Amino acid sequence: MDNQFIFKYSWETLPKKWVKKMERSEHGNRFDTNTDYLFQLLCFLKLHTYTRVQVLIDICGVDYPSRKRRFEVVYNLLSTRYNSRIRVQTSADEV
Amino acid sequence: EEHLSRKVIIYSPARTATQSGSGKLGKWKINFVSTLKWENPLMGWTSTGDPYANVGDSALAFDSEEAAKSFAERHGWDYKVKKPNTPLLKVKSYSDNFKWKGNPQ
Amino acid sequence: PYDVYDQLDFDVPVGTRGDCYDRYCIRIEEMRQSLRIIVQCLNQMPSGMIKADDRKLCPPSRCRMKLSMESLIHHFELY
Amino acid sequence: ALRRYPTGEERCIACKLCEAVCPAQAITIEAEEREDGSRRTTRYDIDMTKCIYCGF
Amino acid sequence: TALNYHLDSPDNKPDLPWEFSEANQSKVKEILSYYPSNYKQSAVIPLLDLAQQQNGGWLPVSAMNAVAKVIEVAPIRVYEVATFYSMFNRAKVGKYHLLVCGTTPCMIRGSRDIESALLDHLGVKRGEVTKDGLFSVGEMECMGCCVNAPMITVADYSNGSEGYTYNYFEDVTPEKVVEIVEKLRKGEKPPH
Amino acid sequence: VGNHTAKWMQDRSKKSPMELISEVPPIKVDGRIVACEGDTNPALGHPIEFICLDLNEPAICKYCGLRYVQDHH
Amino acid sequence: EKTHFGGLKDEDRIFTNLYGLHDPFLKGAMKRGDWHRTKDLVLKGTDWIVNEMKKSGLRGRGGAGFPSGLKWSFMPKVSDGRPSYLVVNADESEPGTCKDREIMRHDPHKLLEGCLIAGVGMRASAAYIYIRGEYVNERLNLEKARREAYAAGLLGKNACGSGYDFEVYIHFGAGAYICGEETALLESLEGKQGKPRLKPPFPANAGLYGCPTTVTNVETVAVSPTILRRGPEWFSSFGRKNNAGTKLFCISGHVNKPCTVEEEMSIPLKELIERHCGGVRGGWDNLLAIIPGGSSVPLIPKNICEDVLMDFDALKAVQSGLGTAAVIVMDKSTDVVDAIARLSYFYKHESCGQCTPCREGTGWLWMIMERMKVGNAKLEEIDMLQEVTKQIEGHTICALGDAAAWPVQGLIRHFRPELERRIRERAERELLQA
Amino acid sequence: RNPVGGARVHFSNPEDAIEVFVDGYAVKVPKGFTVLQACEVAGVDIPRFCYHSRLSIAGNCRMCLVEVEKSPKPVASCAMPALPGMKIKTDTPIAKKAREGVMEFLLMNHPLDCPICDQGGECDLQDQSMAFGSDRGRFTEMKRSVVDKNLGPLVKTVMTRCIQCTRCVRFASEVAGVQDLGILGRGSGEEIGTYVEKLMTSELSGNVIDICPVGALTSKPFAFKARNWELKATETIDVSDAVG
């Protein structure tokens, strides 16, 4: 399970309205999603047979003061089943 | 509360005069005018009691005037904007070094 | 894998009960496997440079910085 | 420790590189042209309680 | 020992008065007449040459200041001109400047065989004037192809600008250069 | 003894570095240029400094304070 | 003829007093044909003169070989208030060259009449002759000739009775090789240091005093009246196509009889050496290398010299140049590396110092050549020398940097085994001795 | 693209504008602009030492060389006028190699005294050596050396660092209006100085410290006192006179 297969299969299978941005790079596969779909996206990735993203490695914030939604919340996840890592991000503000 | 009512300046630092390069311009900063420092009477070290001693020059930064203004107005600070001075490119010719002085007067 | 771990022989001990005793035994075995890895590193240790040669990110030698402008400039910049 | 040349002259020329690199900001330097024109420290302080003994 | 700066001395200091002689005034005017009156700077090189001829073969800083005054420029430009070109002598030379030790085209035919004998006869090192102030040895700068090398150059400053000559001598030998020096001492112009 | 040294040196038993370096006689050199490394082993000294000796006054190495003069002229 | 070139006869020689056997002043000059009906040539007009110069195929004799007629035609047809100037380059400081000195010594009236002709052809009001500062006797002779021409009405107001006004002034340098470069010459004539200018502006638009100006060699100027009188077709009948005319050659070095001679362009180098110089000293088989024209062109080896012709194109095709047509001949007894190091010292000494690559690289090349003279170098330093020459070439304000890089490049190209052998012998001595 | 430094470009008439390409990009510049200025309008920063926008073009440092299509040689962008249809390349191998060679020549005789040079930390030479020529030095011969000159109590002099950019001389001649500084000699031995002993008496003399790209001319009263990275910059106005 390489990062080319994850990118292509996630494009083919995920509901379209969940992902606003998809990056494929040696720095990591990255999915950006609205805050209202984060939970469902993570549940899908955890449960689906072809992803089995079972381990949440961490959650962290990043501050971007020049942005209307200044905070970016990053979810680093791991599939021990397929020996692959995924990054899922969403933005947030102070309230 | 007490530190949210201070007056700040929003500005774009100009280019230094010791270097011809222009790669540090376009950034917008919030000057906190922290000018309350003194000398510690043991070693002569520079002491301060103002929390915003260096955050305006080390961490806080903004890519545009509008972002800095929005941040300042959301935090409630009273801000004044100083527009940066920019050079005027003028027609220059190497031929001008050898201009004819004209007929003698 | 990272660095030269793919050139090295070692086993990965795993437990069967998932309790404190299994983890103690795993740590003992991991020490044994670490000893194995150290022996292999000692025997396979090659000669050559210990710093990346890209002269924009690594300190020059003390003698180079005292002898060469480019080196001095890079040392000043780096530190 | 600060060192001297065998002549007795100080080695330090107040370049301030050590002050810049110090991860703990434990070095404080002031400098000026000495009476003979030499570039030398007037002040060189190390806070031994800030220092992390890293050797940088 | 040419240097790109001046250190004051008793025979070489700005306060010493220096002006073109009355007899040189005709020549200065004729030199100026060759160029538009707002382009007087063009005369710096011939005027510097005339001043060097008048001052016995060298240019004190006062002469440079006087030339700068004639052409109406800051003295720094005249200093630049005087230091850029090798024909100007900014230290004292003898009444007869002997130029030896040529360059590439003549050392193929053995040019470096004349200088040492010249110092040995003159009893001086290169660049210093003799006690009687008659001879000084300098660096020759070469023209031509140096067929009839070795060659030396004699600059005659003994009679100001009206007696100035700048001549090249060919097939000069250690015996012949001493003979040339002897005729120069006795006043006869050596053949060339 | 000067104002510079008095800012840090509070002991007068020993000579200051400024006086100590001034007591070292200028090193005579055959030539108009000399390179100073501050040590017999260059890697243990200071970055190499090339010093012109055209002036009559002794020329000072800006790193170690050693002084050099032209031996003949 | 079209097949072989050389053996120029006396009836086709332009510089008929080159050997100084007759009076060089006005009476002898007219007796030899100078100042003959110059009024008619002037009254023919600028356009006719320019067209004849273009038809003659004359190319610049100062080294670059630019077509003279086109260069003259670069001058403005209508004045914009500024005057037009002609500057004659008599500053030949290149080692091994004396042709312009001979022209000034023995045929000065040729130079003066050519000055007038070129000034009419350039619509110029005045001419400045910039002479080498060391040519004191030559300058005095030329000034005497100028007084003779002014007294006879050939120069000045109403020159030769043609209604054209033309002033000729004599200027001299103070011993700088770089002043031979045209823009450096203009700066020196202005009273500044001899530092070349960047182009653009070109001198035809802003030259002396910021006025339209043409800088051309003494040889180029002095042959124009003869070309006009005898016809462009006669001049173009000599030499190959695009290399027309006669040329002043001077041959020095290891030849039996060195001499200065006027010969047909495109003459074979070997034919020139064995015809006028008595051959290479010790025979042609003793030849090692030849520098075709002046020290500013790369040398060529013995195999190249066998068949190469002396013109701009043939020497250009073998990575060399005609230059000043100063032939320097080196036999097998010469230390070629030492000669190249000597040339490197010359270029380091003569660099004006304005621009960084020349100012520093000339000294660097000289130091490397001095080290390689005795083999005190590594084998890999030859490649470093080549790359330094490439770093200098093409990155400088003027062509002196290229002239400094070329001899080293030629040495590396044609005698690399000699340098390698010197290095190996030095290393062998180092191993056994210590 | 924003011009370098936010520089403003004024057009007398849109008819008097030409079109040039800077690395494929289309930019419009007024007639008479140089290649370097067109690069600045395009937002491309060309390295330079001898060029200064307030002083006459010199074109001697050769650090601003770029590649222009159909040009046989690298072109000094600071002096070459821009032409319509000109295709300017600044990052081709020719330009990079020219910059590397020029930087190597500049550092050849430059002294190894960054730790004692006040320009350290705000030095154009250091930054351009880090950026353009990250070439390992290979010069092993003896460096040239220069004696220091006395210019008064304001300008401290270390002439070994001078790169002969002639900015100070042109400033003295063209801005200060006091012709005291010149360039003396010829070749690698040329030295900036006044020849005779004299101090810089112009009231604008201190600006030569700003314009000198290396630590050759530095503030004597400020000598050695601080590094640029430990200084806090405040933008304000002067009250010494009524000029502001």
Ligand SMILES: Cc1cc2nc3c(=O)[nH]c(=O)nc-3n(C[C@H](O)[C@H](O)[C@H](O)COP(=O)(O)O)c2cc1C
């Ligand atoms: C370093 C250097 C030295 C030069 N010296 C001379 C010279 O002595 N005489 C000369 O005629 N041209 C000399 N030139 C060439 C001139 O710049 C210029 O091309 C010439 O005056 C043109 O004359 P022409 O068109 O009649 O050949 C020199 C060029 C350089 C780069």
Ligand code: SF4
């Ligand atoms: S300031 Fe620090 S780094 Fe610089 S010379 Fe002194 S001790 Fe060394």
Ligand code: SF4
């Ligand atoms: S190439 Fe040499 S001679 Fe020509 S301008 Fe540059 S430094 Fe001067």
Ligand code: SF4
């Ligand atoms: S000017 Fe100073 S800081 Fe810049 S490279 Fe030279 S010594 Fe280093």
Ligand code: SF4
């Ligand atoms: S002192 Fe500075 S400004 Fe003046 S020429 Fe040298 S490097 Fe340029």
Ligand code: FES
């Ligand atoms: S010895 Fe040949 S030019 Fe002087």
Ligand code: FES
């Ligand atoms: S900035 Fe153009 S040559 Fe120096």
Ligand SMILES: [Zn+2]
């Ligand atoms: Zn030292």
